[PDB]
Amino acid sequence: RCNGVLEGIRICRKGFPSRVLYADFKQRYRVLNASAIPEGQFMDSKKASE
Amino acid sequence: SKAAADDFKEAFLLFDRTGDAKITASQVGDIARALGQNPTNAEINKILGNPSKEEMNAAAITFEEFLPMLQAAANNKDQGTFEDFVEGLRVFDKEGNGTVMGAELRHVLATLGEKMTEEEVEELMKGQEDSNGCINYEAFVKHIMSV
Question: With contacts defined as CB-CB under 8 Å, which chain A residues touch B103?
Answer without folding.
Answer: 35-36
